[PDB]
Amino acid sequence: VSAEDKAAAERSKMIDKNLREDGEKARRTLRLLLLGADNSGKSTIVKQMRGIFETKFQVDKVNFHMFDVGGQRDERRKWIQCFNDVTAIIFVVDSSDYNRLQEALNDFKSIWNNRWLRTISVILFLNKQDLLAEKVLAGKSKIEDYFPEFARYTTPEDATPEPGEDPRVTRAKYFIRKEFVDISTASGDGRHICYPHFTCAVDTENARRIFNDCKDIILQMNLREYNLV
Amino acid sequence: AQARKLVEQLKMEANIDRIKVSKAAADLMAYCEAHAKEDPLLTPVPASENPFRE
Amino acid sequence: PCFRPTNITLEERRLIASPWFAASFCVVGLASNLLALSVLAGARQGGSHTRSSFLTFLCGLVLTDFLGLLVTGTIVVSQHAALFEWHAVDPGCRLCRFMGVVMIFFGLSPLLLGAAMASERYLGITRPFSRSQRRAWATVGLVWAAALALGLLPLLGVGRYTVQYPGSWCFLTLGAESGDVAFGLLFSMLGGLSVGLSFLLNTVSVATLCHVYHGQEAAQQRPRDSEVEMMAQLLGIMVVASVCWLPLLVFIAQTVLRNPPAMSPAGQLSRTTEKELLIYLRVATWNQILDPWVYILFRRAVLRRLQP
Amino acid sequence: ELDQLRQEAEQLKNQIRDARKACADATLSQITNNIDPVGRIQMRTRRTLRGHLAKIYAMHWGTDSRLLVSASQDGKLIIWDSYTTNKVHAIPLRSSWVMTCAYAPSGNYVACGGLDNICSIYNLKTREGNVRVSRELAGHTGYLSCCRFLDDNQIVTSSGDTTCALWDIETGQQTTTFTGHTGDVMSLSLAPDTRLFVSGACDASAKLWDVREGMCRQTFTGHESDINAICFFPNGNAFATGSDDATCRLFDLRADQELMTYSHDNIICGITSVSFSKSGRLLLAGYDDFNCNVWDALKADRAGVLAGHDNRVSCLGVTDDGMAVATGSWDSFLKIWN
Numbered sequence: 020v021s022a023e024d025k026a027a028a029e030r031s032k033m034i035d036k037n038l039r040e041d042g043e044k045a046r047r048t049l050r051l052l053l054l055g056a057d058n059s060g061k062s063t064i065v066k067q068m069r070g071i072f073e074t075k076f077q078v079d080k081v082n083f084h085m086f087d088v089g090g091q092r093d094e095r096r097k098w099i100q101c102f103n104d105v106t107a108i109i110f111v112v113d114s115s116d117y118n119r120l121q122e123a124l125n126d127f128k129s130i131w132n133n134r135w136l137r138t139i140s141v142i143l144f145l146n147k148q149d150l151l152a153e154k155v156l157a158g159k160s161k162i163e164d165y166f167p168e169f170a171r172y173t174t175p176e177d178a179t180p181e182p183g184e185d186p187r188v189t190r191a192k193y194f195i196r197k198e199f200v201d202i203s204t205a206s207g208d209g210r211h212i213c214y215p216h217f218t219c220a221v222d223t224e225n226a227r228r229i230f231n232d233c234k235d236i237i238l239q240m241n242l243r244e245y246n247l248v
Numbered sequence: 249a250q251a252r253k254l255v256e257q258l259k260m261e262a263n264i265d266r267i268k269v270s271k272a273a274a275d276l277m278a279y280c281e282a283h284a285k286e287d288p289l290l291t292p293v294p295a296s297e298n299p300f301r302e
Numbered sequence: 303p304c305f306r307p308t309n310i311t312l313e314e315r316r317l318i319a320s321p322w323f324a325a326s327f328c329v330v331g332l333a334s335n336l337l338a339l340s341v342l343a344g345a346r347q348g349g350s351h352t353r354s355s356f357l358t359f360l361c362g363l364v365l366t367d368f369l370g371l372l373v374t375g376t377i378v379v380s381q382h383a384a385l386f387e388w389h390a391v392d393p394g395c396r397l398c399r400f401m402g403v404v405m406i407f408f409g410l411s412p413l414l415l416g417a418a419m420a421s422e423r424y425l426g427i428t429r430p431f432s433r434s435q436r437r438a439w440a441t442v443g444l445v446w447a448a449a450l451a452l453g454l455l456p457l458l459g460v461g462r463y464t465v466q467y468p469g470s471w472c473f474l475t476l477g478a479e480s481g482d483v484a485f486g487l488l489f490s491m492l493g494g495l496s497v498g499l500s501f502l503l504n505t506v507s508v509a510t511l512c513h514v515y516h517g518q519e520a521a522q523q524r525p526r527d528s529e530v531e532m533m534a535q536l537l538g539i540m541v542v543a544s545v546c547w548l549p550l551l552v553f554i555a556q557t558v559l560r561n562p563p564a565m566s567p568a569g570q571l572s573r574t575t576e577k578e579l580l581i582y583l584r585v586a587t588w589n590q591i592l593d594p595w596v597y598i599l600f601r602r603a604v605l606r607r608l609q610p
Numbered sequence: 611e612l613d614q615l616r617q618e619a620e621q622l623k624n625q626i627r628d629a630r631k632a633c634a635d636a637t638l639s640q641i642t643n644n645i646d647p648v649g650r651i652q653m654r655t656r657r658t659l660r661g662h663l664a665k666i667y668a669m670h671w672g673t674d675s676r677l678l679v680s681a682s683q684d685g686k687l688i689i690w691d692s693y694t695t696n697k698v699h700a701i702p703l704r705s706s707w708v709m710t711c712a713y714a715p716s717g718n719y720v721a722c723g724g725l726d727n728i729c730s731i732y733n734l735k736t737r738e739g740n741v742r743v744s745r746e747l748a749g750h751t752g753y754l755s756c757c758r759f760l761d762d763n764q765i766v767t768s769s770g771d772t773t774c775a776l777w778d779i780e781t782g783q784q785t786t787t788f789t790g791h792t793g794d795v796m797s798l799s800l801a802p803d804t805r806l807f808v809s810g811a812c813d814a815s816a817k818l819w820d821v822r823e824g825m826c827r828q829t830f831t832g833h834e835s836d837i838n839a840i841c842f843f844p845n846g847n848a849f850a851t852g853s854d855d856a857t858c859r860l861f862d863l864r865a866d867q868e869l870m871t872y873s874h875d876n877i878i879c880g881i882t883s884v885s886f887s888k889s890g891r892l893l894l895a896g897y898d899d900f901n902c903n904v905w906d907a908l909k910a911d912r913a914g915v916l917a918g919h920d921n922r923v924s925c926l927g928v929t930d931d932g933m934a935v936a937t938g939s940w941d942s943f944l945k946i947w948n
């Protein structure tokens with residue numbers, strides 16, 4: 020066309036190549052959204068740090084960016100829409116205290132049924148497992164006073180209790196997991212799944228747990244893409 | 249004392265002097281009709297006068 | 303050239319050379335491919351989803367099968383009726399060279415495309431941590447170009463296209479000359495490699511899926527309908543592709559290589575060989591008919607959607 | 611104390627409602643029924659600006675009338691020339707989460723904001739080339755939803771903490787603050803005189819704030835959900851508000867009434883953005899249904915429908931010259947309709 024037009028076209032081509040290279044570089048990582056409460060101990064899990072707080076870690080072959088939102092009111096329905104493409108939502112909930120446990124259940128059911136998060140899977144960390152075991156084994160703060168349905172409920176016969184765990188501890192753990200998974204499955208159409216886990220705040224396997232769960236999520240996404248067509 | 253601030257704001261808002269709904273509608277209609285001839289979106293301009301042509 | 307001696311007998315037209323075979327297979331394949339294309343068009347109208355390279359490959363496959371059937375069956379049925387005649391229509395070696403080119407094109411495209419699709423599925427299953435759709439279309443175009451380039455070889459030498467039994471189709475000759483054996487071996491080798499790669503990749507994918515499923519879920523965390531359906535799809539693909547295409551490739555590779563030459567020096571071909579070739583081409587042709595059924599229609603979601 | 615204040619507020623609200631009802635001597639529909647409706651409007655894509663690798667969240671035209679800045683989740687502010695399809699600048703972002711972008715009238719400055727809560731102002735006219743952080747505005751307690759350039763030295767920005775702030779670029783300090791919203795301020799529109807601006811929030815209401823005085827001159831309500839976006843009529847006495855109720859309510863300033871409401875049974879999702887034509891006759895509104903609707907501002911009828919994009923249509927805008935309309939969706943593709 021002309022000299023100015025040629026220069027503009029060359030600049031545009033260089034810019035497009037730069038954007039393509041940056042996208043190729045940045046598409047190999049995974050993004051996760053961290054959620055919970057004040058007492059959930061969100062920052063404790065994944066003991067690595069290599070408004071918005073971003074954490075980076077690198078399991079055997081992949082790198083994860085965990086994004087946490089701070090200084091936000093209860094009206095999460097607005098900014099949550101931003102994270103409609105994250106690979107997973109790491110929902111950390113304190114499993115020791117029972118007074119606020121129902122509030123956590125309500126928060127989880129609100130997150131699960133969100134309009135913009137109908138495809139994002141949830142990795143649930145039932146934190147403070149040691150505190151829960153100590154409280155239940157101490158013969159105090161009965162769960163029945165906060166959960167009438169807990170009574171007359173027994174652990175499934177075809178179950179795998181942790182080695183050395185007392186029957187009461189495993190019973191309480193399974194009750195909590197069952198409540199969360201029931202809320203997960205009642206409204207679930209199979210598009211997204213909830214993965215529960217029991218952390219201890221002194222465990223180094225949380226990163227590997229996230230890695231395995233994200234791998235499974237991606238595999239299921241690929242299988243759905245193949246089959247539905 | 250947020251109640252006092254709310255009361256003051258309400259009084260200030262009510263201090264306005266509305267003229268007429270019909271007058272506002274007529275003014276809007278007149279403004280729309282005045283510029284009706286300068287609306288390329290409303291009236292498709294000639295292809296020779298359209299910068300996005302190819 | 304391009305025409306070889308042959309003459310049908312009385313009983314042959316009634317049982318083996320009857321025209322109902324071509325019409326039946328062509329109509330069934332066309333209807334199945336039309337239904338598959340309708341389903342794919344509906345899915346596309348739903349929206350091009352992420353990692354849609356598989357959708358691109360599937361669309362290319364169904365389109366190739368549909369075009370191949372619609373092109374070849376028309377000529378075959380017309381010749382069966384009495385509209386075309388190799389001794390009267392295009393007597394100057396004009397018409398069925400195109401028929402051989404298109405036949406090779408549409409016989410090679412499905413195999414290579416299936417191999418590519420199997421490779422994509424293997425990558426997406428065994429190694430999840432790996433990734434536009436332009437690349438898929440580029441690959442489809444490259445596959446079609448390779449198939450056509452192989453098909454055009456006899457035009458510039460080596461190969462030879464001739465009208466074969468029952469005098470209704472025109473295909474590569476099973477001669478003992480250097481060019482004939484070279485082209486036959488090349489075609490059979492590429493077909494066998496495509497089938498083998500598809501089978502191997504699908505087997506590895508099915509093994510990985512079985513390891514994932516049989517692997518204890520601990521808490522029954524997942525209903526594995528999706529993994530079971532994929533395993534069934536892959537097993538069907540493997541069995542159908544192999545059992546349908548391998549015999550023809552083996553036959554065309556074996557016929558060219560024989561101590562007593564198959565085709566006599568005068569150009570005559572034994573009736574047994576002609577009948578075997580016709581039967582093997584029919585069983586191979588059924589691959590295209592069953593392809594959309596295995597890939598698309600034999601799906602729980604698609605069957606449920608088409609139920610009402 | 612509290613009871614007396616509540617009674618006074620109730621009395622003031624009742625008096626305001628009575629005055630509003632009295633001023634409602636007629637309806638715009640009755641006046642406009644005598645106007646011949648505009649025929650069907652059919653607009654086809656002319657430019658398909660592509661290159662963004664993530665979901666586009668904002669857009670804003672420029673005074674040059676062929677210029678628009680787009681921001682996405684990949685963390686890039688891309689300045690496009692509408693006439694051609696050649697990118698002019700591709701500024702990178704410190705934070706990949708950006709929700710608001712704004713183009714200064716002079717074209718020498720641009721503004722960006724998002725979940726980081728810190729607004730970044732970049733100077734396009736670099737003395738030695740390259741674009742970097744020309745200024746950083748901080749002090750808000752929430753994510754920034756919208757921002758506009760009153761001039762080359764003053765910038766108004768609305769945050770999710772239920773507040774708006776006028777900042778001086780040269781001083782980099784909060785020269786003024788506006789408060790009173792009960793919900794997050796998700797919208798903001800500047801009047802032609804750049805003196806009074808109407809802002810909406812999650813409180814399902816809008817408020818008119820005067821820049822010089824910084825007082826809530828008027829407050830309008832009626833929406834049943836949050837107001838996602840707001841546009842100001844060119845004349846200077848009316849505006850339009852789009853909410854999640856699948857309704858678009860056009861109000862008035864002098865009348866102090868909800869002049870009209872646009873809704874249809876077929877449309878059920880919320881409206882992401884609103885815009886006005888050069889004369890204001892046509893109202894543009896993008897919907898979550900992946901479409902855009904052109905309504906007749908004086909007939910309450912869906913004049914036209916623009917179909918495009920494979921994902922949510924988020925940002926909308928109309929060039930000052932009024933020759934084209936830009937729309938950006940989560941498909942990662944802007945588009946220009948004419």
Ligand SMILES: CC(C)CCC[C@@H](C)[C@H]1CC[C@H]2[C@@H]3CC=C4C[C@@H](O)CC[C@]4(C)[C@H]3CC[C@]12C
Pocket residue numbers: 316317320322323326327330
């Ligand atoms: C149910 C679906 C899969 C069947 C599709 C292929 C069918 C239509 C094919 C396969 C076997 C075929 C038959 C096989 C043999 C004969 C004998 C003679 O009369 C010629 C035609 C006739 C009668 C064929 C008609 C077509 C046929 C019935």
Ligand SMILES: CC(C)CCC[C@@H](C)[C@H]1CC[C@H]2[C@@H]3CC=C4C[C@@H](O)CC[C@]4(C)[C@H]3CC[C@]12C
Pocket residue numbers: 399400401403404407457
């Ligand atoms: C996509 C599908 C339909 C395949 C289409 C391939 C077309 C282009 C092929 C099929 C048959 C081919 C022809 C077959 C034979 C000859 C005779 C030769 O002396 C010149 C080339 C010519 C005339 C070929 C031209 C290209 C041709 C028409």
Ligand SMILES: CC(C)CCC[C@@H](C)[C@H]1CC[C@H]2[C@@H]3CC=C4C[C@@H](O)CC[C@]4(C)[C@H]3CC[C@]12C
Pocket residue numbers: 505506508509510512513516
């Ligand atoms: C200790 C060793 C044997 C364990 C590893 C093999 C385990 C996982 C077993 C269980 C299920 C098996 C698969 C089941 C089905 C098939 C399909 C068949 O056409 C090829 C073999 C293949 C693909 C099997 C390979 C081996 C397999 C994957």
Ligand SMILES: CC(C)CCC[C@@H](C)[C@H]1CC[C@H]2[C@@H]3CC=C4C[C@@H](O)CC[C@]4(C)[C@H]3CC[C@]12C
Pocket residue numbers: 318542545581584585588
């Ligand atoms: C999925 C597997 C089972 C393949 C599907 C079955 C196909 C290949 C079957 C169904 C009908 C069959 C044909 C039915 C009748 C005849 C006539 C006979 O004189 C030669 C074989 C021939 C021409 C058969 C070839 C194989 C055939 C086409």
Ligand SMILES: CCCCC[C@H](O)/C=C/[C@@H]1[C@@H](C/C=C\CCCC(=O)O)[C@H]2CO[C@@H]1C2
Pocket residue numbers: 319320321323324327328367370371374375376378405406408409467468470471580583584586587590
């Ligand atoms: C190596 C060839 C691959 C072909 C794949 C293609 O997808 C199949 C086409 C078949 C054709 C085979 C040609 C001749 C077979 C004999 C026909 C006859 O004489 O009745 C026609 C009869 O079924 C259809 C149409």
